[PDB]
Amino acid sequence: GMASMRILLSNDDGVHAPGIQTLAKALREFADVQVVAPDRNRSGASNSLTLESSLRTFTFDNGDIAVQMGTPTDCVYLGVNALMRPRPDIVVSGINAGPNLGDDVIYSGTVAAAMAGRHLGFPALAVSLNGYQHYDTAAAVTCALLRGLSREPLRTGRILNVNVPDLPLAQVKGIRVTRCGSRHPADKVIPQEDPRGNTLYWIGPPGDKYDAGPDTDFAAVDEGYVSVTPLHVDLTAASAHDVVSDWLDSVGVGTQW
């Protein structure tokens, strides 16, 4: 083949995570892979990034790069813009231990790292396992996608959010393009007293599934299919445009009459 694929691999769980190390191993059978990922498994970074401080990096013997206290986004940013020359063809983020579905996606560091490689020659993949077991299956599904992208370019969609059923590969039904489901608002806080009687608060579990119908990511994964949802960064709720303009006129905001 005329060209090697050069892949920037990141994740949310840090460089030591088995999900990213399993995927790296699988990708390296056919691709060049540079890992740039958080130094440790931190929870809940979303697409935060480090602006108030400079970031420190560390290179392992195998060449993996960990960014110290780096967010998922930090790592992809540094990887694309400084640490990999020339720039990667594609950012692959995963494999995440745990699903990234529905309206959770915006909170996902795994998705954020992909999000950050949306301007490369291929659409970025965010890869999450619905579980902790079959990294092998998600690795294989990722490999298949990537061979697919190199066979024919995907013309529209700069980020693909891929959720893989936690099954042995032979039981995965196939792949469906899906939209993000939704959840009810999350509302649990779990209070816990410290030894001095002060109340500290844990953020609780997500809200219950609300939109999990036939074409959602939630449905696809439950039915044993890989879910693929293309994502974009534009948060515009266009359907609300007229209602909002009409409301402002109605309440006299921005207009004198």
Q: Give residues 35-74 in contact with Mg ion (rule: CB under 5 A).
A: 43
Per CB under 6 A, 186 contacts ligand ADE: yes
Binding residue per annotation — 13? yes
Q: In the structure encoding, which two tokens stand for residue 3, read together?
A: 């060209």
Q: How far is the CB of 34 from a second copy (least distance, A)?
A: 15
The beta-carbon contacts of 15-20 under 8 Å, at least 24 apart in sequence, are 15/39, 15/60, 15/64, 15/65, 15/66, 16/40, 16/41, 17/41, 17/97, 18/97, 18/135, 19/94, 19/95, 19/96, 19/97, 19/129, 19/135, 19/138, 20/94, 20/95
| Distance of alpha carbon 145 from alpha carbon 7, whole angstroms | 13
**Partners of residue 183 on adjacent β-strands:** 209
Per CB under 6 A, 203 contacts ligand ADE: yes
Q: How far is the CB of 77 from ligand ADE (least distance, A)?
A: 6
Q: Give residues 37-96 in contact with ligand ADE (rule: CB under 6 A).
A: none
Q: How far is the CB of 203 from ligand ADE (least distance, A)?
A: 5
| Distance of alpha carbon 102 from alpha carbon 211, whole angstroms | 8
Instruction: Kindly indicate which of the ranges 54-62, 154-162, 200-208, 234-242 contains the residues binding ligand ADE, using the contact rule CB under 6 A.
Output: 200-208
CA 49 to each of CA 67, 72, 125, 248: distance values in angstroms, whole numbers, following the listed order:
12, 8, 19, 35
DSSP code of 54?
-
Q: Tell me the three state secondary structure of residue 105.
A: helix
Instruction: Kindly indicate which of the ranges 120-128, 169-177, 197-205, 233-241 contains the residues binding ligand ADE, using the contact rule CB under 6 A.
Output: 197-205
Q: For Mg ion, give the closer residue by CB, 4 or 133.
A: 133
Per CB under 6 A, 205 contacts ligand ADE: yes
Instruction: Kindly indicate which of the ranges 92-100, 137-145, 174-182, 225-233 contains the residues binding Mg ion, using the contact rule CB under 5 A.
Output: 92-100
**Partners of residue 92 on adjacent β-strands:** 9, 125
Q: How far is the CB of 143 from ligand ADE (least distance, A)?
A: 29
> For the CA atoms of the chain, what is the radius of gyration?
20
Residue type, 168: P
The one of a second copy, Mg ion, ligand ADE, none whose footprint includes residue 206, by CB under 5 to 8 A per kind, is: ligand ADE
The one of a second copy, Mg ion, ligand ADE, none whose footprint includes residue 47, by CB under 5 to 8 A per kind, is: a second copy
Q: How far is the CB of 126 from ligand ADE (least distance, A)?
A: 15
Beta-carbon contacts of residue 72 (< 8 Å; ≥ 6 apart): 10, 11, 12, 37, 38, 45, 47, 93, 109, 110, 112, 113, 116
The one of ligand ADE, Mg ion, a second copy, none whose footprint includes residue 169, by CB under 5 to 8 A per kind, is: none
Q: For a second copy, give the closer residue by CB, 179 or 209.
A: 179
Contact footprint for ligand ADE (CB under 6 A): 104, 107, 186, 203-206
Binding residues for a divalent metal cation are 12-13, 43, 96
